[PDB]
Amino acid sequence: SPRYAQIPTFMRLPHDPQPRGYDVVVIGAPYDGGTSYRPGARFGPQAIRSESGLIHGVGIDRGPGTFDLINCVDAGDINLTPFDMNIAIDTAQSHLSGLLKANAAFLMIGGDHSLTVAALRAVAEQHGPLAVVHLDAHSDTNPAFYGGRYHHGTPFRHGIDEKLIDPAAMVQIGIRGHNPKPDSLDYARGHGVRVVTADEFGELGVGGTADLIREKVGQRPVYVSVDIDVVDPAFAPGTGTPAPGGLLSREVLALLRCVGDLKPVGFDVMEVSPLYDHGGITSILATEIGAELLYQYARAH
Amino acid sequence: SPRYAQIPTFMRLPHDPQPRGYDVVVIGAPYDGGTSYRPGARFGPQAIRSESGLIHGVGIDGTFDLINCVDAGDINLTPFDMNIAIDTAQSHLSGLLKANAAFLMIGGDHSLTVAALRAVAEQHGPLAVVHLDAHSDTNPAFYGGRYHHGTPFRHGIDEKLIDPAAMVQIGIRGHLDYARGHGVRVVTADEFGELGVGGTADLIREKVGQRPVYVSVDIDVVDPAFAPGTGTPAPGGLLSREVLALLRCVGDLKPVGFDVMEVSPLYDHGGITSILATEIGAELLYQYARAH
Amino acid sequence: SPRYAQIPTFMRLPHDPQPRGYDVVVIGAPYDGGTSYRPGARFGPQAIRSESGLIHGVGIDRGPGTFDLINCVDAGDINLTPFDMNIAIDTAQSHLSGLLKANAAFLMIGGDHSLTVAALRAVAEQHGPLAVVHLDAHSDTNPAFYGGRYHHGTPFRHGIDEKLIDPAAMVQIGIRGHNPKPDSLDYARGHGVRVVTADEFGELGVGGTADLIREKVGQRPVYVSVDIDVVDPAFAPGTGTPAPGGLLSREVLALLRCVGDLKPVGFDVMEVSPLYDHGGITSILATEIGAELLYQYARAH
Amino acid sequence: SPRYAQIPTFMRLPHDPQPRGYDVVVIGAPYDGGTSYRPGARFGPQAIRSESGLIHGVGIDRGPGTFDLINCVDAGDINLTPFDMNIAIDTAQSHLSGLLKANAAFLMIGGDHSLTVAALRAVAEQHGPLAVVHLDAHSDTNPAFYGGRYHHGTPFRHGIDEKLIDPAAMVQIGIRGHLDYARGHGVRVVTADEFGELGVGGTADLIREKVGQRPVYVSVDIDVVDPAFAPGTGTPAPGGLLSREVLALLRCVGDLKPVGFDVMEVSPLYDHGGITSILATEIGAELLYQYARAH
Amino acid sequence: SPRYAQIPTFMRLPHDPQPRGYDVVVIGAPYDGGTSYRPGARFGPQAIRSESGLIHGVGIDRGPGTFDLINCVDAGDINLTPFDMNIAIDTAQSHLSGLLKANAAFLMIGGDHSLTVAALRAVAEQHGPLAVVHLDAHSDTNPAFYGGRYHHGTPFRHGIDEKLIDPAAMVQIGIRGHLDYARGHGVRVVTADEFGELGVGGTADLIREKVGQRPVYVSVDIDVVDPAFAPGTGTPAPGGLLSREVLALLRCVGDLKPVGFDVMEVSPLYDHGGITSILATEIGAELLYQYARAH
Amino acid sequence: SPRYAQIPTFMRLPHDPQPRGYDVVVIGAPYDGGTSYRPGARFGPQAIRSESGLIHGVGIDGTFDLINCVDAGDINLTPFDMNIAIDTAQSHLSGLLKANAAFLMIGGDHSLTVAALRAVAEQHGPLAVVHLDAHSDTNPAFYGGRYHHGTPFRHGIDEKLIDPAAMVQIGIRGHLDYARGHGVRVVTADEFGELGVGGTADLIREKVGQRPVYVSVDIDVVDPAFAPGTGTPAPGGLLSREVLALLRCVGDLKPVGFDVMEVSPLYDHGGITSILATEIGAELLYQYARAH
Ligand SMILES: [Mn+2]
Ligand SMILES: [Mn+2]
Ligand SMILES: [Mn+2]
Ligand SMILES: [Mn+2]
Ligand SMILES: [Mn+2]
Ligand SMILES: [Mn+2]
Ligand SMILES: [Mn+2]
Ligand SMILES: [Mn+2]
Ligand SMILES: [Mn+2]
Ligand SMILES: [Mn+2]
Ligand SMILES: [Mn+2]
Ligand SMILES: [Mn+2]
Incomplete structure (x- = not known):
């Protein structure tokens, strides 16, 4: 069975739209109603599934494959309307909350970053205020707009504001541009968020940044949220707000190794817009x- | 001055964001919040402007010598809220009509046409309509999706912006009682083939007569081969030359507004x-x- | 549920990899081992599924939707090796034959045209020698090659040769170029196949060609095989052997209306190579x- | 011997950079210095060669293949500078003239349409004032100006002005979009609109009547077909001909006395x-x- | 006011086709007549403008925005003929000189690199022989020849030869792939290899030492970065710099006395x-x- | 003569389909019958030739002045049968070596390297190998897929074409006992980062020494950002400059053959x-x- 054969699921995982008893459920969130610039992330889950057949969950020299250590499934997608931002966020929250009633955690494949507010609400409900590792070219702590409460530049502001996040245990890495509009990092920093700009990341290196994450997060339940635009546009051209001067793919992949030293309780990978x-x-x-x-x-569990 | 030189305006027209005294104002509506399938029409005005430099308004055997036109830039349409975007479009388009005769709106998804119809009907009363589309766009609205791109002509008829007895829609195919029951003349792509350009033009002239008419073109009326860059393509469509030839009949009508919607440049x-x-x-x- | 949401199946049909009791099973054949020029048709089923969500099985003014008249399902794909032509053909034959034991018919989404030999073998087994309506820019009655018994230019030669096809009840429409290599239509014509070149189709029109199909086929069980390259490259650029000067999409779609006047027992749509x-x-x-x-x-049944 | 194997030549013809004694030499002209809008036709020959391996010179029910009736070769390209329009046009004429000294005729693969003036100069030197069949969305009879003598909208104005063309035996087909000079000189202009009325057959009859048996040069701008069929071109013009219409119309060439031809304005980047x-x-x-067929 | 709305200007700056009294005018130069390989840089300004709406002139932790410190405007484009290299270069110089009569400086968006000779001519007229920071995969100090005086490999040879540049205050960075003239004139060449050894910091130190406080023109060929980061260019050269390296290196410009700059060779078709x-x-x-920052 | 002019040969070299007396012959292998995922490498030689005109064999601070090279065109490889295609490649490559010193094969999928190894070992005996790849390509063959693109170095070791104690493979990542057990030195992308270009070059020199060495480059060794056009991309790869810098060490070796595989131009x-x-x-x- 060649890897491109069969209806595409994430990493060729089994599909079950009403999953119960799994460790991690992969759930798509095909929505781009929060995008301020280029849309198209509504197709992110479809495109990610289509290309994912290539990738095995077996590493190099890591022993047993992931799927022999934990039970995972592709739960399909959340039925997110493209016509109403507030309804989509509520729908995402409800669906994600549902998944956690019988499954340990989810990996949400987006979809624009606004959806993370729904994920944080679901996860925080189960675990209390969360530590956060956020990889992004943008802080995403901008204020809401008239008619746009949940644009894709707001999710971590809502997370802090609603106490879904313990900002003293939040680290955001890769920051180098403004999303929707210029807004200082004063809000984040004043709340105690540790911001690691792309410049600082260059100084710290993968290792130093990983040490910083372990120190800030400790063993608190942690949500890891990755905006694909963290990496340079050369590595991730398919995204709605590219920001030149970004990380290399290998830096991001190496950094994420530290997650197994933490207590991850949810994660997402957002902003893939396949048309670009x-x-x-x-x-x-x-x-x-x-x-x-x-x-x-x-590894962590 | 090569045609690609200078900041791109529609057909290299002058730009004036607050125009007054023009015959037709070209106005972009960069918004795709009504799209049900592929988004990207928010970039339609930019792409159209970028490619339009190629095109002269001089045919074979000059428009801008006959009438006064200008590119009025764009309507600032939020991408985050369909209700606010439609209201904003309505306000801006209405404002243009207070000071100028008519507009050509470059979309943007077809939902925006309700705003256009509202503005134009405010000046001319209930309108005749010539609608070119693969889809009827007379589907019901529902709570949470009042202005999806399949509703504009339903809103137009419901709100009495359109006189359905003077509305013809041409090109419908793929995958109608409401429209027909209201008196709309629907010309499927199949029927268009039987009638031809000339028979369809005769039908339009018969149905619309001299009534103030809004001509609304969904780019998806033509086959995907001719217009791949669109949100809901429908195979088995009209050839570009058929649409262009058909539109010659507009000069025999009394056009008061027009639009060209659903261009999604990423595709x-x-x-x-x-x-x-x-x-x-x-x-x-x-x-x-020609008409005026 | 927007049309791009959920794991993609053909026209959003339900998925069942072991279908029983359906009228028509949609089955993918992700294989391009028979391609003589550009490959990539192995991705045809995935791409067709991904784009198919757009299309409803409800026509204009046709009353009840197809799926309210007949029971259809997406059976996923045949696991076709990309490394061995003869094994792939045998595998396809076996799988397709299996589907007909509990289902009335299939629609095979290719994959290169070589696979049609397997389909003809399965269908002929159930119905005897078959009438054929073949839409293609190429006759596909070329001889096998040294090391290439089942290239994509051979399927109708094998069908005739093996008596899967009643050539006196076969019509091929759209012919205007040579595939793999130049070969006269003498073999086809000598067998009694009616060839309607693109030129002749222009003279006959959709209506005349449909009359010709009804006359030649009658009420014999008929297999309808469509090579996407029948239409001009403007309408189907994504194919492995384009041939300029082809039919318009609407001509092909209009012509296929005559199928409901026949006794169709199988069909396929081949040679989509999405990379192009x-x-x-x-x-x-x-x-x-x-x-x-x-x-x-x-309509026919 | 798969069609995509080997260094790409036009239709897999043999290559000879100094051909002598052939019937028709296929010569590339990789230049877009005459382009007024999108450039990229400089890559036309390379892209055409690369895609051409697909196409056999054997038709359906047409008999022996072209290459069994005439001896053809791919002569490579003319070394045309991208930096100077006048030098490129001169170089083109010299090279094309050279080919005609040793071979009956050439098929030039462009490259932008300005190059056709060089071809006409070379061909008229051998045959005298020429009949012309020109397929294009644009008339290409616009005036030259200082600094742009050979923009791509000039070749047929030069041809007429220099008496390389007998305009009373020129027909241009497909004109549309956005003509006194041409008509006043006796050129028959068939707009896309008129082509729709006449049809392939009527237009072919018209061509035969206008050209007769005068030596004829056939120049095709790929932009004659609708952008749906030829997106890769520098000045697309919506509302054009179908591929099948152009191919069917060209059948009439075998009833004429063709002495050269070209296929211009392919810009593969688009x-x-x-x-x-x-x-x-x-x-x-x-x-x-x-x-x-003609010969 | 979404970033993709409105007619596209560079970074959504106001437009004024006859700007006077500004600090820096952004001027497009839509021309690729100097290109030796792939054309298409004529569309550079249009594509750059279209994509630029994304980018704010506000940095991270950098204080007040650029446009709050200096007054900038998008001056539209120079009307550059695609048909004649010499006329285009002359036109460019005239237009750029005009801008300098009424505005402090310009940022030219190309267009192929040959245009930089016009910019250097205009800028040196105001400031005298210039220091230069040149980022490129190629030295662009190749000789001119008759018929191609201004190909895109010549701008810095012209600049040095015409004494528009003080070569003892010129540094070029990123050179690689496939230099006596430049070195013999005192230019400091930093190959991509040497840049890897020196690093951003070492190279910036070198720039500061070489340029000092002499009026300096900063010319960036987009092909200085690896093709992975800038695929849309006419002569890509594998093995180039990372985007972040180029952006970080350019921070040193605020320690200098910049009097003009450009960003050339974007060819959006690729x-x-x-x-x-x-x-x-x-x-x-x-x-x-x-x-x-500098001023 | 502009670099895009003339029929495309590799780096504008002369063409001779039956070369004799050259130092290195460039030979295309237009075949993707071993690909397990995306096909299209059959077009690799054509695309590489088409783009290669850009590149001069003159560096900074001239190859074709030092050695005699030629583009020998392509091997006529059937797309329909993997066993016949490998045998054909072997025969053709062996023929080239009877009359010329070495070849550079432009692929084509990596399965073809078994044919190359067979031909080169016929001239030089069991070979040292420097293999750049995201993948080890030492997977087992199986009936019906003897020469899939994940097998070439397994065949090389099994058939004694390679001395595994003098084989180093660099770049391996993503998703090895056979190779390691045979003495192959595997340098993962992670280890490469630790060693750097210079440390890796030292390791290669140490392992290979002066033994006749075949250098086989899978384009997928570099990150997909630098080489998107390939059949099995693997994120987190080397930068182009790292690969190019590393390959400088080949001049300190005794190279007897090389290849550059898996370019799939459609991607x-x-x-x-x-x-x-x-x-x-x-x-x-x-x-x-430099080496010779
Ligand atoms: Mn971001
Ligand atoms: Mn984000
Ligand atoms: Mn529509
Ligand atoms: Mn519509
Ligand atoms: Mn075919
Ligand atoms: Mn076929
Ligand atoms: Mn033309
Ligand atoms: Mn022309
Ligand atoms: Mn350069
Ligand atoms: Mn340069
Ligand atoms: Mn590999
Ligand atoms: Mn490999």
Whole structure:
């Protein structure tokens, strides 16, 4: 059975739209109603699934494959309307909350970053205020707009504001541009969020940044949220707000190794907009990030 | 001055964001919040402008010598809220009509046409309509999706912006009682083939007569081969030359507004969809001059 | 549930990899081992599924939707090796034969045209020598090659040779170029096949060609095999051997209306190679062709 | 011997950079210095060659193949500078003239349409004032100006002005979009609209009447077909001909006395699926066949 | 007011086709007549403008925005003929000189690199022989020849030869692939290899030492970065710099006395996801910021 | 003569389909019958040739002045039968070596390297190997898939074409006992990062020494950002400059053959994969000159 054969699921996982008893459920969130610039992330889950067949959940020299250590399934997608932002967020919250009643955690494949507010609400409900590892070119702590409460530049502001996040245990890495509009990092920093700009990441290195994550997060339940635009546009052209001067794929993949030293309770990989991609490299990278997160969940638990 | 030089305006027209005294104002509506399938029409005005430099408003055997046109830039449409975006479009388009005769709106998804109909009916009363589309776009609204792109002509008829007895829609195919029951004349792609351009033009003239008419073109009326850059393509469509030839009949009508919607440039190839959209717009501007 | 949401099946049909009791099973054949020029048809089923969500099986003014008249399902794909032509053909034959033990018919989404030999073998086994309506820019009655018994230019030669086809009840429409290599139509014509070149089709028109199909086929069980390259490259750029000067999409779709006047017992839509496509228009057309065939099956039965 | 194997030559013809004694030499002209809008036709020959391996010079029910009737070769390209329009046009004429000293005729693969003036100069030197069949969305009879003598909208104005063309034996077909000079000189202009009325057959009859048996040069701008069929071109014009219409119309060439031809304005950067270059190959293939039929 | 709305200007700056009294005018130069390989840079300004709406002139932790420190405007484009290299270069110089009569400086968005000779001519007229920071995979100090005086490999040879540049204050960085003239004139060449050894910091130190406080022109060929980061360019050269390296290196400009700059060779037809044009915008944005910082 | 002019040969070299007396012959292997995922490498030689005109064999601070090279065209490889295609490649490559010193094979999928190894070992005995790849390609063959693209180095070791104690493979990542058990040195992408270019080059020199060495480059060794046009991309790969810098060490070795495989142009963007492949080939040719 060649890897491109059969209806595409994430990493060729079994499909079950009403999953019960799994460790990690992969759930798509095909929605881009929060996008402020280029849309198209509504196709992110479809494209990521299509390209994911390539990727095995077996590493190099890591012993047993992820899927022999933990039980995972592709639960299909949340039925998110493209016509109403507030309804989509509520729907996502309800669906994600549902998944946690009989499954340990989910990996949400987006979809624009606004959806993370729904995920944080679901996860925080089960675990209390959460530590956060956030990889992004943008802080995403901007204020809501008239008529846009949940644009894709707001999710971590809502997370802090609603106490879904313990900002003293939040680290965001890769920051180098403004999303929707210029807004200082004063809100984040004043709340105690540790911001690691792309510049600082260059100084710290993968190792130093990983140490910083372990120190800030400790063993608190942690949600790891990855905006694909964290990496340079060369590595992830298929995204709605590219920001030149970003991380290399290998830096992001190496950094995520530290997740297995934490207590991850949820994760997401957002903002893949496949129409802007080239050779599917963005969706392939998104898959690999997802795979690494799953493996690290296994290692951690 | 090569045609690609300078900041791109529609057909290299002058730009004036607050125009007054023009015959037709070209106005972009960069918004795709009504799209049900592929988004990207928010970039339609930019792409159309970018490709439009190629196109002269001089045919074979000059528009901008006959009438006064200008590119009024865009309506600032939020991508986050369909209700606010439609209201904003309505306000802006209505404002344009207070000071100028008519507009050509470059979309943007077809939902925006309700705003256009509202503005135009405010000036001319209930309107005749010539609607070119693969889809009827007379589907019901529902709570949470009041202005999806399949509703504009339903809203138009419901709100009495359209006189359905003077509305013809051409090109419908793929995958109608409401429309027909209201008196709308539907010309499927199949029927269009039987009637031909000339028979369809005769039908339009018969149905619309001299009534103030809004001509609304969904780029998806033509086969996906001619317009790949669109959100809901429908195979088995009209040839570009058929649509362009058909639109010559507009000069025999009394056009009071027009639009060219649903160009989604990310799906285009070689810019051909945006070039065709420009040519459609150009034809409409010329026919406005001929009519008036 | 927006049409791009959920794991993609053909026209959003239910999925069942072991279907029993359906009227028409949609089965993918992700294989391009028979391609002589550009490969990539192995991705045809995936791409066709992905773009098919757009298309409803409800026509305009046709009353009840296809799926309210007949029971259809997406059976997933045949696991076709990309490394061995003869094994792939045998595997396809066996799988397709299996489907007919508990289901009335299938719609095979290819995959290169070589696979049709397997389909003809399965269908002929159930119904005896078959009438054939073949839409293609190429006759596909070329001889096998050293090391290539089942290249994509051979299927109708094998069908005639093995008596899977009643050539006196076979019509091929759209012929205008040579595939793999130049070969006269003498073999086909000498066997009594009616060849309607693209030129002749222009003279006959859709209506005249449909009359010709009804006359030649009658009420014999008929297999309808569509090579996407029948239409001009403008309408189907995503294919392995384009041939300029082809039919319009609407001509092909109109012609296929005559299928409901026949006794169809199987069909396929082959040679979509999505890497060469633009805006997905080829896969969208392939979907619509499939939809029309399904509707016509319903009408006929 | 798969069609995509080997270094790409036009229709897998043999290559000879200094051909002598052939019937028709296929010569590339990789230059876009005359382009007024999108450039990229400099890559036309390369892309056409690459996609051409698909296409056999054997038709359906047409008998022996073209290459069994006439001896053809791919002569490579003319070394045309991208930096100087006047030098490129001069170089083109010299090279084309050279080919005609040793071979009966050439099929030039462009490259932008300005190059056709060089071809006309070379061909008229051998045959005298020429009849012309010109397929294009644009008339290409616009005036030259200082600094742009050879923009791509000039070749037929030069041809007429220099008496390389007998305008009373020139027909241009497909004109549309956005003509006194041409008409006043006796050129028959068939707009796309008029072509729709006349049909392929009526237009072919018209061509035969206008050209007669005068030596004729057939020049095809790929932009004559609708952008749907030829997206890869520099100045697309919506509302154009179908591929099948152009190919069928070109059958009339075998009833004429063709002495040269070209296929211009393919700009592969704007193409999709290589369909423009595949069509250009098929047009060239039809022209070669009709050359064999005529002679 | 979404970033993709309105007619596209560079970074959504106001437009004024006859700007007077500004600090820095952004001027497009839509011309690729100097290109030796792939054309298409004529569309550079249009594509850069279209993608630039994304990018704010506000940095991270950098304080007040660029446009709050300096007054900038998009001056539209120079009307450059695609048909004549010499006329285009002359036109460019005239237009750029005009801008300098009424505005402090300009940022030119190309267009192929040959245009830089016109910019250098205009800028040196105001400031005398210039220091130069040149980022490129290629030295662009190749000789001119008759018929191609201004191909895109010549601008810095002209600049040195005409004494528009003080070569003892010129540094070129990124050179690689496939130099006596430049070195013999005192130019400091930093190959991509040497850049790897020196690092961003070492190279910046070198620039500061070489340029000092002499008026300096900063010219960036987008092909300095690896093709992975800038695929949309005419002569890509594998093995190039990372985007982040170029952006970080350009921080040193605020320690200098910049009097002009440009960002050349974007050819959008070869771009993917618009990433080249987005990067070009960010480079321009950094140059404007460093101009404000310097002054 | 502009670099895009003339029929495309590798780096504008002369063409001779039956060469004799050359130092290195460039030979295309247009075949993708071993691909397990995306096909299209059958077009690798054509695309590489098309883009290669850009690249001069003159570095900074001239190859074709040092050694004599030629483009020998392609091997006529059937797309329909893997066993016949491998045998054909072997025969053709062996024929080239009877009359010329070495070849640079431009692929084509990596399965073809078994044929190359067979031909080269016939001239030099069991070979040292430097293999750059995201994948080890030492997977087992099976009936019906004897020469899939994940087998070439397994066949090489099994058939004694390779001395595994003198084989190093660099770049392995993603998703090895056979190889390690045979003495192969595997340098994962992670280890490569620790060692750097210089440490890896030292390791290669130590392992291979002066033994006749075949250098086989899978384009997928570099990150998909640098080489999108390939059949099995693996994120987190090497930068182009790292691969090019590493290959400088070949000039300190005794190279007897090389290849650049798995370019699949349909997935490329801006031709960057084919341009990189050309530069890799160019570097290898220069290092051949330096070594010999
Ligand atoms: Mn972001
Ligand atoms: Mn984000
Ligand atoms: Mn529609
Ligand atoms: Mn519509
Ligand atoms: Mn076919
Ligand atoms: Mn076929
Ligand atoms: Mn033309
Ligand atoms: Mn022309
Ligand atoms: Mn350069
Ligand atoms: Mn340069
Ligand atoms: Mn590999
Ligand atoms: Mn490999």
